[PDB]
Each structure stands twice: as C-alpha cells, then as structure tokens.
Amino acid sequence: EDTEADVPVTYGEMVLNGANLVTALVMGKAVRSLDDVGRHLLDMQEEQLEANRETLDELESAPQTTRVRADLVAIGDRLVFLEALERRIYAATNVPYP
Amino acid sequence: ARHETGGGVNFTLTQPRGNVDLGVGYTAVAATGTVRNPVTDMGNLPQNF
Amino acid sequence: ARHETGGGVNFTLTQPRGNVDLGVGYTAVAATGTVRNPVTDMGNLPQNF
Amino acid sequence: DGTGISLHRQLRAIQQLARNVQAVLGAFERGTADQMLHVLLEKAPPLAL
Amino acid sequence: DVEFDALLGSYCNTLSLVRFLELGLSVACVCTKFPELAYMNEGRVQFEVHQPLIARDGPHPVEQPVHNYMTKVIDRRALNAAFSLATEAIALLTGEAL
Amino acid sequence: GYRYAAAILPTGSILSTIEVASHRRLFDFFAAVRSDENSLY
Amino acid sequence: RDPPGYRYAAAILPTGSILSTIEVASHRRLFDFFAAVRSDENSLYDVEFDALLGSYCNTLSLVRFLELGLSVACVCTKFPELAYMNEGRVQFEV
C-alpha cells in the first residue's frame, strides 16, 4: 500500500532562547524548553490541587507534510514500512553494508 | 484503616465482594489448546528411600 | 579549515550527533535469516602447539 | 515556610497522593477482572471431558 | 562567490541526492537539529514509569504502589567527513585572479 | 529522577510497561521508591 | 576537590566594583578558588553545560471493567451493605 506521506523538516530546532541562553552559560545547566516548564511550575504554583492530566506541554498547529515514494506492506495488524538501502545510500561507496 | 507503620503511614483498603454461580449447569468451559513449556525435565532420577 | 600544503585546501567538515536508546522495552529486535557464505571454510587446519 | 520552595514541596506531595490514589482505586477495577477467572476456574470443566 | 553558491551549489540539483526524511527510515528516527551539541558535557533524559497494581484477596501480601525514576546519558561518537579541493582550483574559481 | 522539579512538567508522555527489568538495569541513576518517601521533599 | 570553577559570564555584568586595589596574593591563603592569568588564557573562552532533555511520564490506562469484554459474562450490581450480610441465598425454582 505504497507512496506514503512523510514529514520533510528535521523535526524541531532546539535553539538557545532567552531562557536557555542565560541558563546555559551562567548556571552551567540547560533544560529542553525551559520556556514552557518555567511557566508551568509557576502556573500550578498559584492554583494547585493537581490535575495531573498533561504531558506538561504540547501545541503548535501543524507538522509540514510531503508525499514521497515509498513502500508500505501490511503485516499482522500493523502497517509496517519496508526498506532496503543498498541501492539508495550505499551504492558504489566504500562503506560496508551494516 | 490507618493503623500505623515505621517510616511512614500505611492506609489499607478493603473491598468486600460476593459472587454466585448463576446458571443451572456448566455455564463456562475451558480448553487446553496448546503447551507452553515442559516444567520438569523428564526424569532419570531414582527415588532414594 | 584550509590546507596551505598544496593539493587544495582539503580540510574536514565534521558534525557531532548524540542519541539515546529510547524506550524502556526492547525496541527493534533484529532477525537473522539467510547465509551468504562462510568466511572460513570447514577446513582441515591442524592445531600446531 | 511560606517561601518560594516550601510552597512547592507541598505540591510535590499532592501529586504523589493523587497518583497513589488514582492507582489503588483503579486496582479494584483491575481486581474485578482477576476475581472473574479464579471463580470461573472453580467451575468450567475442560472441553475434553 | 558564495552568493552564487547559495543559488547554484545550495539547491536546484540532485544528480544523485538523498534527503534523509525523504527516505523511510525516518519513522524510526526522531531528528532534531540541536546546534550547540558540541558544547555539552552530558545529555540527560529522565524516564518515570508508574507501575499499577491489583488488589489481591485473602492470605496474601498487600500490593503497594511502586514508581520507578531513571535517567540516561547521550553518546557522542564524533562524526567526520572527507573533502578534497584541488590546487589551481578553489583559489582560481573563488576570487584570487581573473 | 535525579532532578524533581523538572519532572513536574511532563515534557512528553511515557508509553511503556517495563518493571525493574532491562530499563532499570540500563540506567545511570534509578531510584525505586515506595509510595512513602522522605527524600522527595 | 575544588569549587565549581569561576563563572565568566557572571561578572560580565558585575554587581559591584571593588573599592580597593591591592596585590591579590597578599591574601592568597584566604580564597577558595583562585586563578592568576597572564593577560589572556585559553580557559577564558570555553563554555560547558549539560541538559535534561525532557521527561517521559506515562499515564496508565484507567480501565473501567465495564469498558472491557469480560463484563458480559458477569452481572455486576453494587450493594453498599455487604459488610453486614453473613448469609445470603438465591432460590432457583425450576
């Protein structure tokens, strides 16, 4: 069941923002998305009593999608992909096939 | 039933249940349909009295 | 960088890349099924002490 | 203490009590199913017999 | 010279080109461009699992709610490549005369 | 885990079922704590 | 052994300028961390850190026993007085 749609962008740009700049070079530590969790530990600080009911953040509107040449096979219940990369990224090089 | 303990406090929770076989005869049935593994090795050990 | 040695500039672009084994389970079993060729034959080489 | 941390250490003990109490109340929702099979295998003789 | 290379040597040609997320291994791979990865000492991810329990009847030990807190570290394996421009080549075509 | 206040934000969800097995015998810092604890606070 | 170094991004915005200038080795036995550079060094420039890259805290699927196949085999009726029963019967006339 071929020709799957895939995501083209390298997923995410974890860059040192205004929180992760000042935390990294000064305090010698960093946290992925301290912008988020710096707000969530203070939002549940004013009003608490738990929830918990969250992955502590996720929302931004979309991933980008592009349909690509591919092969999808149906094994069992799962729609499992199938690939062989000796022709794509290993032809005429000197890397042994892994 | 907050009874007590050392290193903390234990709350235990009892929930009494009651169930009755409800049809007249043979309301469920089981079937051995496979064998997973043999637990014992098959013998070659004699009884030592 | 750039080589001032001749033959071009030829220096190395390098990229670092880190990863974590993700998943508390087993996550990507691999299965071995076929034989292409034995790298050593079933040979007749004697042990020489 | 009323300081910025001792307000927070209250909240960490609240989430444990919440996610301790969410499990054990769900345990009887799981213990109900485990109470099925150990009385349905009081009845249900095997299919071969 | 790079103002032409941003036009010509940056895109608009394949002749043999692969994109990774074009390829269908990328459903195995989270991929995230973290550009300051050279500067890190360690890279930690915390896992927390919350193991449920089942009430057990009669003369039995009593099931206690257990939690498991654990961390990992990243691994670097600093990758290299190999490049060779030629004498009378890069200088000639990047502004040393002409 | 090694840090507690960062765990108050979930930063994703966990989806596994593994006990004190493989995932626990792979970690740098694991702490298997019963429901009552003192060092959490 | 040593305290965690000096922090060079700290005191790029200094909270106070020292009101007195002396030779610093005159109280060398006073300090805890101490580094006396020669007009530049290599360790003035490098940065280093380590990051907690996001937790993963699974939520167990709260299974309602009715939201499960096995509760068609069984009746399930509540009885909030079952601790006070001591005997019970169903009569079954056929």
Q: Which of G41, G54, G74, E29 is nearest to A56 (CA)?
A: G54
Q: Are F33 and F7 in contact (CB under 8 A)?
A: no
Query: Which residue type is seen at G60?
Result: L
DSSP B4-49: --SSS--B-----------SSS----B---------S---------
Q: Which residue of A has its CA nearest to G6?
A: A26
Distance CA A43, CA D3 (A): 16
Chains G and A touch (3+ CB pairs under 8 A): yes
Q: D4 — contact with chain B (CB < 8 Å)?
A: no
- The first and second tokens of residue E64, run together, are 């206690």
The distance of G62 to chain D (nearest Cα, Å) reads 6
Nearby residues of C45 by Cβ (< 8 Å), 6 or more positions away: none
Cβ atoms of E83 and C15 closer than 8 Å: no
Alpha carbon separation from G35 to A2, A8, E47, G32 (Å, rounded) = 64, 49, 39, 10
Q: F35: which chain D residues are within 8 Å (Cβ-Cβ)?
A: 16, 20
CA distance A14 to A16: 7
Give, in order, the Cα–Cα distances in Å from D15 to each of A17, B1, D18, D25, F36.
30, 22, 5, 15, 13
Helix (H, G, I), strand (E, B) or coil at G17: coil
F17 chain-E contacts, CB cut-off 8 A? 49
Closest CA to C15 of E78, G46, G49: E78
User: Are F16 and C26 a contacting pair at CB < 8 A?
Assistant: no
Name the residue of chain C whose CA is nearest to E83's CA.
Answer: C10
Residue of G nearest to B23 (CA): G92
Interface residues from chain E to D (CB-CB < 8 Å): 50, 52-57, 63, 65
Distances (CA, A) of A33 to A37, E44, E46, E91, G50: 7, 14, 14, 44, 14
Contacts of A55 (CB under 8 A, 6+ apart): F10, F11, F12, F13, G57
Surface-to-core class of residue A61, CB atoms within 10 Å of its CB (0-12 exposed, 13-18 middle, 19+ buried): exposed
Q: To the nearest 10°, the Cα dihedral for D38, D39, D40, D43?
A: 120
CA pair distance B13, B4, nearest whole angstrom: 14
Chain E residues within 8 angstroms (CB to CB) of chain B = 55, 57, 62
CB atoms within 10 A of CB A32: 23
First to last CA, chain B: 51
Report yes or no: G51 and E43 within 8 Å, Cβ to Cβ.
yes
**Contact status, residue G66 vs residue G75, Cβ threshold 8 Å:** no
Instruction: Decide if G55 and E41 are in contact by the 8 Å CB cutoff.
Output: no
Distance, C-alpha G51 to centroid of its chain: 12
Tokens of G13: 């915005």
- Burial (CB count within 10 angstroms: exposed 0-12, middle 13-18, buried 19+), residue C8: middle
The residue of chain E nearest to residue A4, with distances taken between CA atoms, is E24
Look at residues B33, C20, A11 and name the one whose alpha carbon lies nearest to residue D48: B33
Q: How was this structure determined?
A: cryo-EM
Smallest CA–CA distance from G58 into chain F, residue: F14
Contact A10, E29 (CB under 8 A): no
Q: Using CB atoms, which residue from B12, B15, B17 is nearest to E62?
A: B12
Q: Measure the CA–CA gap between F4 and F23, rounded to whole angstroms.
A: 20
Q: How far is B10 from chain E (nearest CA, A)?
A: 10
Resolution of this model in Å is 4.1
Distance from CA of residue F41 to its chain's centroid?
15
Distance separating the N- and C-terminal Cα atoms of chain E: 13
d(CA C12, CA E81): 6
SS3 F5: coil
* Amino acid found at G74: C
Residues of chain B with C-beta less than 8 angstroms from the C-beta of F34: 8
d(CA E72, CA E67): 17
Mode of pairing for the β-strands spanning E40-51 and G56-57: parallel
E11 touches chain G (CB under 8 A): no
Report d(CA E84, CA B5) in Å as an integer: 73
Quickly count: other Cβ atoms within 10 Å of residue E63's Cβ: 15
Query: By three-state DSSP, how is residue C31 classified?
Result: coil
Tell me the sheet residues that pair with E68: E49, F32
What H or E segment, with its residue span, contains residue F21? none
CB contact under 8 Å between D46 and B32, yes or no, is yes
- How far does the CA of residue A11 sit from the closest CA of chain E (Å)? 5
Which 3 state secondary structure label does DSSP give C34?
Answer: coil
Q: Which residues of A touch F1 (CB under 8 A)?
A: none
Q: Which two tokens stand for residue G70?
A: 């096995």
Residue F4 identity: Y
Structure tokens given for B48: 């030592």
Rounded CA-CA distance D39/D31 in Å is 13
How many CB atoms are closer than 10 A to CB E89? Answer: 13
d(CA E71, CA F4): 12
- Joined together, the tokens standing for residue G59 give 């939520």
